Design a protein around this ligand. Structure first.
Ligand SMILES: Cc1cc2nc3c(=O)[nH]c(=O)nc-3n(C[C@H](O)[C@H](O)[C@H](O)COP(=O)(O)OP(=O)(O)OC[C@H]3O[C@@H](n4cnc5c(N)ncnc54)[C@H](O)[C@@H]3O)c2cc1C
Ligand SMILES: Cc1cc2nc3c(=O)[nH]c(=O)nc-3n(C[C@H](O)[C@H](O)[C@H](O)COP(=O)(O)OP(=O)(O)OC[C@H]3O[C@@H](n4cnc5c(N)ncnc54)[C@H](O)[C@@H]3O)c2cc1C
Ligand SMILES: NC(=O)c1ccc[n+]([C@@H]2O[C@H](COP(=O)([O-])OP(=O)(O)OC[C@H]3O[C@@H](n4cnc5c(N)ncnc54)[C@H](O)[C@@H]3O)[C@@H](O)[C@H]2O)c1
Ligand SMILES: NC(=O)c1ccc[n+]([C@@H]2O[C@H](COP(=O)([O-])OP(=O)(O)OC[C@H]3O[C@@H](n4cnc5c(N)ncnc54)[C@H](O)[C@@H]3O)[C@@H](O)[C@H]2O)c1
Lengths: 401, 401
């Protein structure tokens, strides 16, 4: 930890990191360069309460635990020179650094087939995006969402609640193929269908003409707006240019170190080890952004602290469904607690591998989620009959381990 | 480049690196720890001329260009402490380092279904392996090879030449699925079949009983010996333990830097950027081992030298077929020069993407290979009619660019 500290990006990972630096006791210079001209804010509301209620002052991140930080908002870092230990900014200034931290996140992947479209096509990542989408979210309007992932489905639910007609195109035979159990994805598809979402599976957009979207099955979908949610690509251009190991994401170890001395990275821009799979993955969860940012900061201030070690988890709020998912999407067995029904949805899934809990899902069952994460963390191997048994208290079972 | 230099592993990548350090002008200490108690040697002969002729003094690597290097042969590096800058050796000694280089390569992946077998099952990676296999390679014996990759097929050819009956089981519908054009793989399968190799495609070993191998189609193959060639796994255990970013291979940039200050890696143990695909891959070729070792050394001695930048290529000698393959296995088009025939096999493949040469294969046509690699290197976009035309001289075409 060499002063001064410069952080590129002013999202959740950046804020979490700088607050932890200060809290851990680092009092040297911290300068944060953020390309959006926005007080740092949290993104999940953009698909939900913000999209619905429009108040950005309800979604700002609290920078209170990060005192004495200079935030350069509306400035783009253009390059860094890792030999000179400098960063070049879009406003013509240069920042020196002792330690450079890349927290530049990811940007929505564009749909190559809609590139030259002449109807509204938006992605949903920023406050600017949400405002632009929002300004077209009139009741009875026709929305086409491309991509049946977390963001697409969160938007789908919000749009339906607002009285917008929603069609959604997904290339896979299922929703949420990236980070959800099949059982969950099947249920989620049935829920959205029942709420009036027109789901199109195993279909791709081949292009568009005068407000009509064309599909690979040779059919059409007329829409007033297309929102594309087909994933993100890491904002790793500065790292690539400077010679760091990257591949749609900057490779880091559990200390957040890149392959370049004195340059660290954290959050959505990183490819890191998933301790459950033991594979490198871009982990794009809110919890990763916060906890990885905190872990890297903690270890920079105190080298005796452990590396980042948290197991991955996320939530997704989709209308009546409060979904929570931890760990791996599958194992050799799934245990279902509760019935899976559109009538007052409430259930839990537990994924096991060779008797060990490797994943869990809760739908409208937050009570169960925290104990399951504890069981997951220690690689617990509880009685599978007990795990299935409705009489079992998971919080009690977790404590017993 | 801080002295002293310690290299873990004494294979081709290690030898290439240390020779280049000396040639580039580094004269400080170099100590190489090699777990095999063997004068450093080259591995390709082990599936061919060594397997056939048995003279290990014909396969040693020339360490002449690496003067004043201490080679600790028959010693295993057990761990390194990247804070203390020390390496712990199996003989109880500790080495200090200014710069640590991990060149520990890869080890044959074992077949989980043959783990408790009671017939000879060998892998083919070392001189010890080759000698053990060789001592069972009697004419008229029955050899089963598992895996239809480069090593399996090189061994298959050598075994057939020696009068050994050869059956070969492959899980994929094709041979060499990892790094060969389909057109090549199809031809290679026809060649081996014509030489008497009993090929079993889309089959897996489910186990074995008293000298009989069991398959997933529910059938049997009796054999006197099984050689397993189903790929390798990076020898990255020390890196993993020490906190470096690894995932079946140590991630490095074009300078060979790992995520750990003062620790580099090179050769088969590395995951690195393939400049043609722009993706990270474990590149396990002989040419990578040499050229990456040289590039990393060159840049350590002279920081103004460029990073490693070579495009991937390899050869495979399989009986009458002298195969050479460069770049990517496929593009949007393949151009074939010559006819593809078992009657005096001689042909060239050129893979193009958006008109640019992105890959090439030569079978018994070495003359064409070097010019095609030059065309590949500069991303040439020659006239496709000229590329197809038999009257075209590729060496002349390359020079014209
Ligand atoms: C619509 C939406 C809904 C979401 N809902 C959920 C959810 O339900 N569950 C969940 O787990 N997560 C959710 N996420 C939240 C998401 O997980 C976090 O926002 C993300 O993980 C934060 O990661 P980050 O801080 O690394 O990156 P970012 O938030 O992307 O921040 C990086 C910042 O750096 C900026 N930047 C990039 N390059 C430069 C440069 N050169 N110079 C200066 N600045 C630069 C970027 O523009 C960006 O402002 C949602 C996200 C969106 C967009
Ligand atoms: C049978 C066979 C046939 C081949 N034919 C071809 C071919 O046709 N074309 C082609 O391109 N390539 C061929 N290859 C050659 C291959 O590409 C090279 O041998 C390889 O790329 C060399 O890489 P390396 O030096 O990084 O690793 P290695 O050669 O594996 O050397 C690493 C060395 O480090 C040692 N080591 C590992 N851990 C430790 C430790 N902790 N302490 C000390 N020492 C350690 C290993 O045991 C090994 O001796 C073939 C290989 C084999 C085995
Ligand atoms: N578990 C998580 O990783 C998680 C959870 C919540 C939020 N997030 C945030 O959301 C971001 C990604 O959001 P997203 O929902 O856009 O991506 P996503 O990966 O969650 O889903 C994209 C979906 O689009 C589909 N798709 C891909 N190409 C397509 C195409 N051409 N046409 C139609 N469908 C296509 C995929 O199959 C997938 O179902 C992340 O960066 C992260 O910050 C991530
Ligand atoms: N192009 C190259 O990367 C290249 C070229 C020459 C030599 N080499 C050397 O060879 C090593 C790998 O050699 P290899 O031939 O053993 O691996 P390989 O990857 O070349 O081929 C392994 C083959 O086994 C098949 N396979 C995987 N699992 C199987 C299973 N369970 N049952 C049956 N088949 C299975 C794969 O489909 C593949 O065709 C590398 O480390 C490298 O050092 C590499």
């Amino acid at each position: 930890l060499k002063a001064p500290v410069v952080v590129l990006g002013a999202g959740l990972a950046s804020v979490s990191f700088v607050a932890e630096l200060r809290q851990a006791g680092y009092q040297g210079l911290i300068t944060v360069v953020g390309d959006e001209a926005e007080r740092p804010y949290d993104r999940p509301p953009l698909s939900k309460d913000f999209m619905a209620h429009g108040d950005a002052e309800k979604i700002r991140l609290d920078c209170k635990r990060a005192p004495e930080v200079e935030w350069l908002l509306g400035v783009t870092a253009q390059s860094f020179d890792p030999q000179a230990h400098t960063v070049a900014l879009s406003d013509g200034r240069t920042l020196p650094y002792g330690t450079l931290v890349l927290a530049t996140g990811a940007a929505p992947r564009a749909l190559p087939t809609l590139q030259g479209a002449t109807m509204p096509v938006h992605t949903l990542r920023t406050l600017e995006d949400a405002r632009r989408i929002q300004a077209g979210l009139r009741p009875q309007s026709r929305l086409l969402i491309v991509g049946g992932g977390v963001i697409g489905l969160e938007l789908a639910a919000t749009a339906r609640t607002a009285g917008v007609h929603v069609s959604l195109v997904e290339t896979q035979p299922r929703l949420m193929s990236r980070a959800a159990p099949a059982t969950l994805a099947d249920f989620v598809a049935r829920y959205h269908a029942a709420q009036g979402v027109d789901l199109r599976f195993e279909r791709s957009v081949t292009g568009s003409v005068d407000g009509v979207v064309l599909l690979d099955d040779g059919t059409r979908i007329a829409a007033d707006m297309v929102v594309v949610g087909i994933g993100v690509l890491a904002n790793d251009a500065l790292a690539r240019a400077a010679g760091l190991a990257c591949d749609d994401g900057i490779f880091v170890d559990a200390y957040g170190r890149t392959t370049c001395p004195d340059v660290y990275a954290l959050g959505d821009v990183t490819r890191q080890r998933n301790p459950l799979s033991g594979r490198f993955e871009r982990i794009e969860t809110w919890s990763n952004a916060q906890n990885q940012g905190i872990a890297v900061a903690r270890h920079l201030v105190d080298p005796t602290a452990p590396g980042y070690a948290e197991l991955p988890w996320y939530w997704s709020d989709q209308g009546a469904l409060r979904i929570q998912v931890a760990g791996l999407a599958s194992g050799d067995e799934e245990i279902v607690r509760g019935e899976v029904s559109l009538d007052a949805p409430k259930f839990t899934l537990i994924e096991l591998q060779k008797g060990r809990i490797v994943g869990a899902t809760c739908v409208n069952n937050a009570r169960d989620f925290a104990p399951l994460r504890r069981l997951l963390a220690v690689g617990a191997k509880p009685d599978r009959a007990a795990l299935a048994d409705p009489a079992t208290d998971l919080r009690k079972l977790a404590a017993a381990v």
